[PDB]
Design a binder for this molecule. Structure first.
Ligand code: ZN
Length: 269
């Protein structure tokens, strides 16, 4: 039960596909210089990213979690879309002129698909550059560097860096009149459900698609890891683009090895 590595055969499906869903994970941004969760980039100070991206973490030490998110926002400041992001964006524009739909369902919070020009984007895990008020619930875009003055020069990643220990009053706060609630990043933490509206949107896309790509993702985090398998179970061809095999590889019709910045321009031409 094993995937094909034939691009020519994938291209035969691609030529006819009317409704393509492209699922991405951190590997799509690796060639932009954005750290992944797997490997060495997935550590900040002595923690793993899945240690800090939790409601318990935030409740216990919101300064520490904000220092972590600050660091990621600042990392992003210099980063640009790569050839894989661009191929995806250009594909959507080209096919759209022909009446054919391409939609990107990303786990990423890095906004690089946006910067590349993707329009049909579902950020299923939220965005590094939005806030949500824990008091009022308002969602706001926020690209400020630093997001608050007390985080200026904070966030360094090296193990043994002292906690900034910023009092909650000096962490990012809501600016709505009379609120002043503590902000959090408008991201999905481990242990938190996705937004129901997002689940519904995904469900509609997967049920309607006739071709699916699964790009740069380890296929370990749920529910997102369920998505491409479900499409394959329907009998729809799924093509995995990854520098390695994953637990999901053998569920799919195709496996294209190598950096997606190389393979996606070729696939989506
Ligand atoms: Zn508020």
């Amino acid at each position: 039960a094993r995937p094909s590595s034939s691009m020519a055969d994938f291209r035969k499906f691609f030529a006819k596909a009317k409704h393509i869903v492209i699922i991405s994970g951190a590997g799509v941004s690796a060639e932009s210089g954005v750290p992944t969760f797997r490997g060495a980039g997935g550590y900040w100070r002595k923690w793993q990213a899945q240690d800090l991206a939790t409601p318990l973490a935030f409740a216990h030490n919101p300064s520490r979690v904000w220092e972590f998110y600050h660091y990621r926002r600042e990392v992003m400041g210099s980063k640009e879309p790569n050839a894989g992001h661009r191929a995806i964006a250009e594909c959507e524009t080209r096919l759209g002129k022909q009446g054919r739909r391409v939609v990107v369902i990303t786990q990423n919070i890095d906004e690089l698909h946006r910067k590349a020009g993707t329009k049909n984007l579902l950020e299923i895990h939220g965005s590094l550059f939005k806030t949500r008020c824990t008091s009022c619930g308002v969602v706001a875009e926020n690209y400020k560097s630093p997001i608050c003055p007390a985080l200026s020069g904070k966030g360094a990643p090296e193990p043994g860096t002292q906690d900034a220990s910023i009092p909650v009053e000096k962490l990012p706060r809501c600016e709505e009149a009379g609120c002043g609630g503590l902000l959090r990043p408008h991201v999905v933490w481990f242990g938190e459900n996705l937004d129901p509206a997002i689940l519904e949107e995904v469900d509609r896309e997967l049920a309607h698609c006739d071709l699916c790509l699964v790009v740069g993702t380890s296929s370990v985090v749920y529910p997102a890891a369920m998505f491409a398998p479900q499409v394959a179970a329907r009998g729809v061809p799924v093509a995995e683009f990854n520098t390695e095999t994953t637990p999901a590889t053998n569920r799919f019709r195709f496996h294209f090895q190598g950096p997606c910045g190389t393979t996606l321009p070729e696939a989506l031409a």
